[PDB]
Amino acid sequence: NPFQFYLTRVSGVKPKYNSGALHIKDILSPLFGTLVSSAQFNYCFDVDWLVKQYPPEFRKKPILLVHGDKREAKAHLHAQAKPYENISLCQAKLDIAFGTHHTKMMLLLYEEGLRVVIHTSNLIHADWHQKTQGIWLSPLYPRIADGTHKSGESPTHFKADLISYLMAYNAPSLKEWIDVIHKHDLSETNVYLIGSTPGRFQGSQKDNWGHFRLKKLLKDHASSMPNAESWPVVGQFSSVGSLGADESKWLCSEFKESMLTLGKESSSVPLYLIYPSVENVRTSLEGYPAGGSLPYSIQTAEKQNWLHSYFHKWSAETSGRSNAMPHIKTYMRPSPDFSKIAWFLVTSANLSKAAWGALEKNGTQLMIRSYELGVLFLPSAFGLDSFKVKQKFFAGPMATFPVPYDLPPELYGSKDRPWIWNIPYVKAPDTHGNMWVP
Ligand SMILES: CNc1ccc(C(=O)O)c(C(=O)O)c1
């Protein structure tokens, strides 16, 4: 397969559903390269657990943790890392209120080259245990010979775009990694980077980040087809922000408008949103505690009940993961019969203005609160007009894209409700015999 899109291993499913999945111990294995140094970008860390995931022979190599914690949270993380003299920390600046360092990325420097891993899991045991999570694995990027002058750039501009994303941190520890990336050849990369960084972007910079970045790539590197109005948009996520009092405020006016872009020329497009129902959570492998990683508040939800008519259940028979609650986030553009897709995005970004950006100043400024990162698969980057959807995720041409959940998505029933994490559920017990009392 050219796509190098993986799911994490799920404890308790049959082996056929983990053959081809990756655990963190597999990613860090000496089989992937001889580690010299690594950077772990994430939101939440269990440092004791994380170090044990490295091979014992690599556990004293330098590790940089890139996080967004402040005040007592920052103090707690430093206390976690203090026992390990090889661990350094980088606090990403969050100068806009209510922002989050949400990006999940590994930079892995080897004796043999460099690897980039962009994924969706926190660095804690539970996120790699019984959840549906996504991973993109870069090729092994060889080093450019000293004295040789070449760009090492891919047709998707991934090298410059990754350096641009790291430059936005304005951090000395990340300038070191920028210099590492400069010395490697990333020309085999076939995905486009889509990042968010905090700020207020106008003019030339408006297309650099968030949903305007997605719009620009789809304008420049996708083509519109006849009946494009019939090709749905699918969004799939683990958290929902405050989107406004109706769909015209953001969801269907700028978010959907960016998502439905195809090609360069100047809506009835169906919008499917996939988010676990209460029943999905109750009957999951984890039970109700899976809802601790689905942070949708009652105070947010009751201001936007209009949104829930867009919601579809989590179902993933194709990958054996219907009971493995999703922490992956994905967005895609299927055909009207869901047999093909025009593009696929795996990202850290949930369905929120903080992650994707919201227009300000009479539409001239895109404001983003958070750090996010994902990779976009476009058929043009593989010499194709569209991707065929793989019928079974772990089954056997390799030019079919492995969509990890079932199509078409199934609408909530009349008795279904979205998972809301801070209200009680005491009518029926979960798979472990328990209720949910926040
Ligand atoms: C908006 N509140 C969230 C904070 C952190 C995370 C994470 O897992 O990093 C998530 C999520 O991805 O569901 C949401």
UniProtKB/Swiss-Prot annotation:
Instruction: Name the predominant localization.
Output: nucleus
The impact of changing K329A is:
Abolishes hydrolysis of the covalent intermediate between the active site nucleophile and DNA
Could you give one GO CC term from the UniProt record?
A: nucleoplasm
Query: In UniProt terms, what is the effect of altering Q133A?
Result: Slightly reduced hydrolysis of the covalent intermediate between the active site nucleophile and DNA
Keyword annotations:
Cytoplasm, Disease variant, DNA damage, DNA repair, Exonuclease, Hydrolase, Neurodegeneration, Nuclease, Nucleus, Phosphoprotein, Repeat
For this protein, the Enzyme Commission number is 3.1.4.-
Q: What is the reported tissue distribution?
A: Ubiquitously expressed. Similar expression throughout the central nervous system (whole brain, amygdala, caudate nucleus, cerebellum, cerebral cortex, frontal lobe, hippocampus, medulla oblongata, occipital lobe, putamen, substantia nigra, temporal lobe, thalamus, nucleus accumbens and spinal cord) and increased expression in testis and thymus.
Instruction: Share the record's PTM remark.
Output: Phosphorylated on serine and/or threonine residues, but not on tyrosine residues.
Detail which positions bind substrate.
Answer: K104, K329
Coiled-coil region = none
Effect of mutating N350A = Reduced hydrolysis of the covalent intermediate between the active site nucleophile and DNA
Q: What class of enzyme is it?
A: hydrolase
Q: What is the effect of changing K104A?
A: Abolishes hydrolysis of the covalent intermediate between the active site nucleophile and DNA
Which terms in the Gene Ontology molecular function aspect does this entry carry? 3'-tyrosyl-DNA phosphodiesterase activity; double-stranded DNA binding; exonuclease activity; single-stranded DNA binding
Related illness: Spinocerebellar ataxia, autosomal recessive, with axonal neuropathy 1: A form of spinocerebellar ataxia, a clinically and genetically heterogeneous group of cerebellar disorders. Patients show progressive incoordination of gait and often poor coordination of hands, speech and eye movements, due to degeneration of the cerebellum with variable involvement of the brainstem and spinal cord.
Q: How does it assemble?
A: Monomer.
Kindly provide the name given to this protein in its UniProt entry.
Answer: Tyrosyl-DNA phosphodiesterase 1
Species the sequence originates in: Homo sapiens
Q: Provide the gene name from the record.
A: TDP1
- In terms of the parent sequence, the fragment covers 162 to 607 of 608
